RNA sequence: CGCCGCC
């Protein structure tokens, strides 16, 4: 919760107007959160099982970042 | 589209030769030109030799 | 820095040491003078006017003619050869490799 | 030596935005409507109404004074420019900014150059 | 054509057996009057470029990339114009031999070959287009680049030799209106003093140009040598099909320095239209020059009733402001020669019913004769064998007070001004394009400009799209979508403010539109109305379909038609557009278009802001960094992003243009319709990058993709991905083959049937009739 | 007076050099008035 | 090979520069954690304060080293600089490799360990 | 013609350049003597430059075929 | 800032031939100190020259701020000579060192 | 570049003989490097047998040395006058003669 | 106050 909620304002300026419930951020700041956001799921999971990060293929990466059964 | 007034062309065409035809076309037409003309004026001392 | 010794050791011979206002032109003395030489050969850089700087100027060759010319018509074969088409290029270099 | 205490700074300010407050910030926040009344925001007659001049106190990061006004070059990271950097230099910081202009100008040339005949 | 050059013949022809149709005595005084004019404004003539010229590659380039623009399609002939864009490249990969060729052609050729005329078919306008060989054209080229460089460093031309390089709109108004307001108690009307302007073209001035009086005149001011170049070149053998005629008398203005002579020769035509003290008067000491309608301490400017003046190319604008005796002994004048009263149901506005009638001009007895005796004073003093001033097609207009509404057409588009003080209640002047103009000595506002487009204006509009309906047959859908988009971002980009008055403009804007919306129904054989729903127009490229900037959905308005012609009445009863009322709400192109007079209101504050940032780093010692960008770095009418660009250091070289662009209709046969501007110099003057985004919504982002095969354009999931041709449409040499004919003219299918594979859900969809239908075999 | 006398041509003294009335026909077709106003109102 | 050194790694920054290699692997990321710089070929007049004066410029340096010799000289050739922040060494070693102090071409690179007191390359 | 002009001009040059002697010298002896004790006493940042290449008009030629609209790119 | 542009030395192209000694003293003193002039004796070289300074920006005003100056009534044009060659290399010099410095 | 050697010129001669005269690309047909316009420029400024391309006159040189006073450029408009008409044949005379009249 | 529908 902690550091994907000080992800989601990546400036000291990132309103969110009252009728919608995420920030409101440009584009290039979206894939910009999405690809911190993804390094911050697999940092967890490499903490947590003690595995490298890198030597991961990317169908294993699909895997652990919707979370299937591994 | 206009069926009246596009650049027309027919059918079975065979289409506009290469550059080698072309200009092989050209001399054997500028063979035929000059042969003409130095046949209007009757010269008598062209020939032309076992190797064109 | 130099001496006037050094400085003729440099230098070649055939050489001597010794608001505005608007009003008109004139029909003038004919300023036309060449800059390109005298026939086809090929087009000079302006850098590469003291290297064949004497094919600007005509020799008509008697009165300022040794042989000489002769060893300088080889600065027309090197002027064809460095800026010319190739069919120039070969006539020039098959020409100064025969003489 | 002073990359530590950027890194304190992005930590203390993390630990701010982390510890207590929401996951979104909306217009009101009590922050941003004290940064809106705290803006520059050029093009203020009662500028120089409250100001005296543009003056110089110990305006620097450690109480050690820091550097005159001259113009520092534009360097890509912004520096503590500081005991007399007087433009000397291979010439590479302009090198480098022209080329990535030049590479964003070709690119608005080759949008314009790609989408033609579409 | 035929007709055309024959004439032209017998008149060449008769040009040498009748003598020059100019007098000696008549000759000698314009040569007299040129060279006090240019002495009294030490005027140091012209030297021959040398070859060691610093500012000489900078002009060849120039050149080379203003002919190089005329080749951006690549359909291009056998030999013409490849052989010219080979000249062009060869001018590039060797700038010196090119210019030294241009300086041996400049001082030693004066014999020049063929030039082949064509006339674009313009629909009540016919202009013609000459073609010279392309080793003249590169010479000429860059000899028009350095005369117009180097008689505007020296300042040859006055300010009022239009167009400069301000705009044309500037020149139009908030020069000219603000000029016409800013005099000095304009309209007092209480002494019978009255305004006039007179509107005229120097009739013929093109042909009426004898090259021997030319070649002695501009010899003044060019050196000798290659006077004789520009008189030279101008006599050269007319070509057609079979009619070769010599040149002799006028001028071929297919030249590329011809726009150098047209306003020179327009210099010495109105400085004989001004007398030479006025035209002193007005350009001012040149030890500080005046600006365009500026004078010196205007005292100067209460004597000499021509208050001020501007000549656009070959077209005359005056503006006499006369106190009443001195119109009582101009108008007793004329009538010593011109009996017989009541002949007055001619002057101006007795046919042009643009304007309502009270806004029209009165055509009291004192006024008509007034504005019919400035035209006879204004016809003479101009000699009929050089140019004439022809009453028909001018147009004089006067203010006094019987009549209280100045009326003129300027630049394009027409207006009038109806002051303040003459209104019962104020004419609102807040709505529309309207601008207000006010006196800048006194910080109030005075005047109301009431704006509408000319109506040859929408005459050449409409004979445009009525071209690109004619080509329809040869082209794609999606070439005549992008040819009524070029045409509309053209009449709408500049006529921006008058195209909201204009009514009848508006009513040809939605007959037009669905014109060409009809034509690409009847290319689908179609013309259903649910058969081809306007999702299929109305919708970006990108995404694909055709992307047509709307402005047919507007609800025309109207007025009583009794009271219409009457009197500016107000507004009531909005009538419907096109005819599509489901509430879909497709987006004008207007809104997407900075209107005139906020564009000049943002242009003076940013300049004015440029300039105090400037002195601001500049007092201090810091570094303007992104502090340009608070005006958008895009505002102001030379936009600001112009000054830090690439080619700053050659643009500035590129001078006197915007009259070499309008003199480029007689060039290429490209009817430009942006002749205007062009984006280096005065940067992007819109941008319309939000219609795309707006019109997506104004349809839905899944919009067409409903319509569109994308279910099966594959399992493609995402469509944000998804992106268009690319592959090779240029082709540059495209592996350069042999093309019989229909494969070289005809028109390219497979475009034309990918967007009709595209939308096939809806342009086959079951049930629009339900009768028969046809399964193919297999 | 007093208003252009600097001007050069003071006056041409004469507007078509006695009077525009001819209603005449040339029936040379190019020469005929009709072709010349055609020719002059849409060519320019 | 005084000095074809600065010919290596100029030729360095021209080739990323021809290559386009993002600053996330630009050669820069293997000299993290190290804000220290070896200078090369200094003149034998340079104190640590002119040296502090030239180099300041990317911002103040904390630790400088000169080599001075043990007795019988003043100075050897070389020094290491610590600034601030090690993205000075980043500008330092781009900008200030290969310019000229009163004749002799000085160089700039990156250290990663420590001051060492004579290894480097005299 | 031109020779009744160019000499009338030249005359002028003359008389005016005269007048420069007469006017400007004079004024130097009243610039010399001083009669009171004569003798007896932007820097613009390199980020903005070269943003767009060019020199064209950008509004090719005058050919109406080839979508100049929307200067940037959609997605 | 310049080591790679030769000075010292201009040469002069398309001269009249009316320059009795004068003219090249005036126009090529009146930027500096000379060191003195070579003039051609063949009509090809006669109509053509050098000049040689003492000083290397006069040379850069000569050359920056002459090119296709029109004189008398032929403009001349200016370039840097390229000194390449000698004919005699000059030996037994003393230049001993005698206590100058 | 248009250099026109000789063995284009007789070919050309020859083709004017058999085509005809407002018959170009007929006769550019067979030439490899020209094209129409090149051939009516050669034909009409070199190779037409009424140029008389040699024999200065001087009834026509006293002609044309006061012809080309009145109107001083336009070698085109004074070469059908002058009949020598090859419009740069004239171009010679008045350069050639305004040579030996300053000498 | 509501054009339009194609062989
Ligand atoms: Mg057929």
């Given at each position: 919760n902690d550091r994907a909620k000080v992800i989601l304002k990546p400036d000291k300026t990132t309103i969110t107007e009252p009728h919608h419930i995420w920030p409101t951020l440009t584009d290039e700041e979206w894939i910009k959160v999405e690809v911190q956001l993804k390094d911050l799921i697999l940092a967890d999971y490499g903490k947590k099982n003690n595995v490298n990060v890198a030597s991961l293929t990317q169908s294993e990466i699909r895997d652990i970042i919707l979370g299937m059964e591994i | 589209m206009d069926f009246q007034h596009r650049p027309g062309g027919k059918t079975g065409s065979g289409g506009v030769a290469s550059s080698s035809e072309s200009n092989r076309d050209r001399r054997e037409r500028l063979r035929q030109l000059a042969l003409e003309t130095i046949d209007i004026n009757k010269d008598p001392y062209f020939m032309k030799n076992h190797l064109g | 820095p130099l001496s006037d010794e050094e400085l003729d050791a440099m230098f070649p011979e055939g050489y001597k040491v010794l608001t505005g206002f608007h009003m008109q032109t004139e029909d003038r003395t004919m300023k036309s003078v060449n800059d390109q030489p005298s026939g086809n050969l090929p087009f000079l850089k302006p850098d590469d006017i003291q290297y064949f700087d004497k094919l600007l100027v005509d020799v008509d060759e008697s009165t300022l003619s040794p042989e000489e010319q002769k060893e300088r018509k080889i600065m027309k074969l090197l002027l064809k050869i460095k800026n010319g088409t190739p069919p120039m290029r070969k006539a020039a270099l098959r020409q100064i490799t025969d003489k | 030596g002073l990359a530590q205490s950027r890194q304190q700074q992005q930590n203390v300010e993390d630990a701010m935005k982390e510890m207590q407050k929401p996951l979104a910030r909306y217009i009101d926040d009590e922050d941003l409507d004290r940064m809106l009344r705290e803006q520059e925001r050029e093009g203020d007659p009662m500028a120089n109404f409250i100001k005296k001049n543009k003056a110089k106190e110990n305006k620097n990061k450690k109480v050690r004074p820091r550097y005159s006004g001259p113009a520092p070059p534009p360097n890509r990271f912004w520096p503590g420019y500081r005991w007399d950097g007087v433009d000397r230099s291979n010439g590479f910081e302009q090198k480098r900014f022209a080329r990535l202009a030049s590479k964003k100008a070709v690119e608005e040339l080759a949008y314009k150059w790609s989408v033609e005949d579409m | 054509t035929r007709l055309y050059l024959k004439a032209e013949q017998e008149r060449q022809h008769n040009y040498l057996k009748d003598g020059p149709y100019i007098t000696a005595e008549e000759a000698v005084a314009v040569y007299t009057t040129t060279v006090h004019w240019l002495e009294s404004r030490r005027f140091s003539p012209i030297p021959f470029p040398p070859l060691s010229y610093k500012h000489d590659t900078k002009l060849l380039i120039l050149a080379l990339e203003r002919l190089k623009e005329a080749y951006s399609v690549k359909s291009r002939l056998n030999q013409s114009q490849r052989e010219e864009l080979g000249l062009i490249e060869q001018a590039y990969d060797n700038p010196h031999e090119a210019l030294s060729r241009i300086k041996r052609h400049l001082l030693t050729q004066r014999a020049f070959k063929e030039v082949g005329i064509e006339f674009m078919d313009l629909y009540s306008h016919l202009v013609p287009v000459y073609d010279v060989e392309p080793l003249e054209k590169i010479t000429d080229a860059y000899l028009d680049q350095y005369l117009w460089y180097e008689a505007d460093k020296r300042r040859l031309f006055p300010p009022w030799i239009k167009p400069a390089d301000t705009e044309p709109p500037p020149l139009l108004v908030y020069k000219w209106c603000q000029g016409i307001n800013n005099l000095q108690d304009v309209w007092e009307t209480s002494e019978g003093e009255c305004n006039v302007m007179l509107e005229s073209r120097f009739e013929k001035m093109y042909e009426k140009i004898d090259l021997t009086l030319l070649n002695r005149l501009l010899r003044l001011i060019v050196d000798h040598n290659i006077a004789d170049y520009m008189t030279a070149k101008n006599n050269v053998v007319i070509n057609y099909k079979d009619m070769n005629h010599t040149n002799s008398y006028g001028i071929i203005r297919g030249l590329q320095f011809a726009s150098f002579i047209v306003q020179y020769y327009g210099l010495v035509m109105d400085l004989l239209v001004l007398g030479l003290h006025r035209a002193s008067e007005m350009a001012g000491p040149p030890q500080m020059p005046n600006d365009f309608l500026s004078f010196q301490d205007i005292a100067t400017e209460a004597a000499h009733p021509i208050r001020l003046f501007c000549r656009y190319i070959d077209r005359i604008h005056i503006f006499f402001r006369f106190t009443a005796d001195e119109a009582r002994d101009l108008i007793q004048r004329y009538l010593t020669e011109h009996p017989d009263p009541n002949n007055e149901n001619i002057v101006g506005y007795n046919n042009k019913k643009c304007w309502p009638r009270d806004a029209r001009m009165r055509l009291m007895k004192h006024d008509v004769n007034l504005g019919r005796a400035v035209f006879w004073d204004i016809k003479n003093r101009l000699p009929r064998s050089v140019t004439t001033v022809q009453w028909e097609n001018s147009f004089v207009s006067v203010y006094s007070k019987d009549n209280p509404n100045l009326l003129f057409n300027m630049c394009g588009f027409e207006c009038r001004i109806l002051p303040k003080c003459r209104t019962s209640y104020e004419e609102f002047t807040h709505k529309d394009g309207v601008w207000n103009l006010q006196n800048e000595v006194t910080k109030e506002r005075t005047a109301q400009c009431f704006l509408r487009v000319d109506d040859e204006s929408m005459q050449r509009f409409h004979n445009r799209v009525r071209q690109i309906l004619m080509a329809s047959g040869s082209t794609t859908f999606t070439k005549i979508v992008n040819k009524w988009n070029t045409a509309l971002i053209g009449l709408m980009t500049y006529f921006r403010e008058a195209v909201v008055n204009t009514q009848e403009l508006l009513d040809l804007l939605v007959k037009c539109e669905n014109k060409i919306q009809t034509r690409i129904k009847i290319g689908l054989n179609s013309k259903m109305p649910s058969r081809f729903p306007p999702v299929v127009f109305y919708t970006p490229k990108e995404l694909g379909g055709l992307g047509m900037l709307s402005m047919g959905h507007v609800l025309i308005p109207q007025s009583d038609l009794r009271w219409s012609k009457q009197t500016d009445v107000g507004i009531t009863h909005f009538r419907s557009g096109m005819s599509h009322e489901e509430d879909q709400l497709i987006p004008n192109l207007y809104r997407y278009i900075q209107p005139w007079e906020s564009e000049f209101i943002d242009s003076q504050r940013v300049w004015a802001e440029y300039a105090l940032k400037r002195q601001e780093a500049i007092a201090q010692n810091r570094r303007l960094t992104l502090?340009?960008?608070?005006?958008?770095?895009?505002?102001?009418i030379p936009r600001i992003n112009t000054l830090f660009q690439k080619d700053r250091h050659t643009l500035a070289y590129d001078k006197g243009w915007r009259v070499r662009t309008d003199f480029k209709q007689y060039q290429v046969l490209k009817q430009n319709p942006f002749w205007w501007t062009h984006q280096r110099h005065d940067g992007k003057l819109w941008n319309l990058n939000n219609y795309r985004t707006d019109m997506i919504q104004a349809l839905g982002g899944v919009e067409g993709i409903l319509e569109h095969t994308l279910f099966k354009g594959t399992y493609f999931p995402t469509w944000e991905g998804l992106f268009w041709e690319k592959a090779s449409?240029?082709?540059?040499?495209?592996?350069?083959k042999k093309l019989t004919n229909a494969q070289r003219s005809g028109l390219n299918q497979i475009p034309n049937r990918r967007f009709t594979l595209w939308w096939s859900p809806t342009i086959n969809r079951a049930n629009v009739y339900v009768g028969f239908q046809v399964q193919l075999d297999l | 007076r007093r208003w252009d006398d600097d001007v050069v041509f003071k006056n041409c003294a004469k507007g078509v050099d006695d009077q525009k009335k001819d209603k005449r026909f040339v029936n040379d077709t190019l020469r005929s008035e009709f072709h010349k106003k055609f020719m002059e109102k849409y060519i320019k | 090979n005084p000095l074809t050194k600065v010919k290596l790694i100029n030729e360095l920054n021209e080739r990323e520069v021809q290559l386009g290699v993002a600053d996330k692997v630009s050669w820069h990321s293997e000299y993290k954690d190290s804000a220290w710089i070896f200078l090369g070929g200094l003149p034998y007049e340079l104190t640590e304060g002119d040296i502090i004066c030239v180099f300041s410029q990317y911002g103040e340096i904390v630790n400088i080293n000169l080599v001075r010799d043990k007795k019988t000289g003043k100075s050897k050739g070389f020094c290491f600089l610590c600034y601030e922040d090690q993205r000075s060494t980043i500008l330092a070693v781009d900008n200030f490799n290969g310019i000229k102090i009163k004749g002799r071409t000085i160089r700039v690179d990156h250290v990663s360990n420590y001051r060492a007191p004579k290894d480097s390359e005299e | 013609a031109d020779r009744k002009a160019r000499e009338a001009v030249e005359m002028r040059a003359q008389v005016e350049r005269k007048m420069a002697q007469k006017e400007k010298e004079k004024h130097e002896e009243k610039l010399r003597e001083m009669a009171q004790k004569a003798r007896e006493r932007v820097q613009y940042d390199q980020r903005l430059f070269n943003q767009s290449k060019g020199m064209d008009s950008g509004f090719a030629g005058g050919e109406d075929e080839i979508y100049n609209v929307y200067d940037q790119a959609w997605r | 800032r310049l080591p790679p542009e030769v000075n010292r030395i201009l040469y002069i192209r398309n001269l009249p031939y009316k320059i009795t000694a004068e003219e090249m003293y005036d126009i090529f003193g009146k930027y500096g100190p000379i060191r003195q002039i070579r003039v051609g004796n063949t009509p090809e070289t006669r109509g053509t020259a050098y000049v040689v300074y003492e000083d290397i920006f006069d040379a850069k005003n000569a050359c920056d701020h002459l090119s296709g100056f029109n004189v008398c009534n032929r403009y001349l044009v200016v370039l840097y000579y390229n000194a390449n060659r000698a004919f005699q290399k000059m030996d037994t010099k003393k230049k001993e060192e005698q206590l100058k410095l | 570049g248009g250099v026109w050697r000789n063995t284009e010129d007789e070919i050309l001669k020859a083709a004017v003989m058999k085509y005809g005269k407002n018959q170009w690309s007929r006769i550019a047909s067979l030439l490899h490097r020209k094209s129409a316009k090149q051939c009516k420029a050669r034909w009409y400024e070199w190779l037409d047998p009424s140029i008389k391309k040699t024999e200065w006159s001087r009834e026509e040189e006293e002609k044309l040395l006061h012809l080309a006073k009145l109107m001083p450029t336009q070698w085109r408009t004074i070469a059908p006058i002058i009949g020598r008409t090859a419009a740069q044949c004239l171009e010679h005379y008045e350069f050639l003669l305004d040579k030996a009249a300053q000498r």
């Open positions: - | - | - | - | 502090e340009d960008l608070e005006d958008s770095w895009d505002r102001g449409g240029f082709e540059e040499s495209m592996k350069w | - | - | - | - | -």
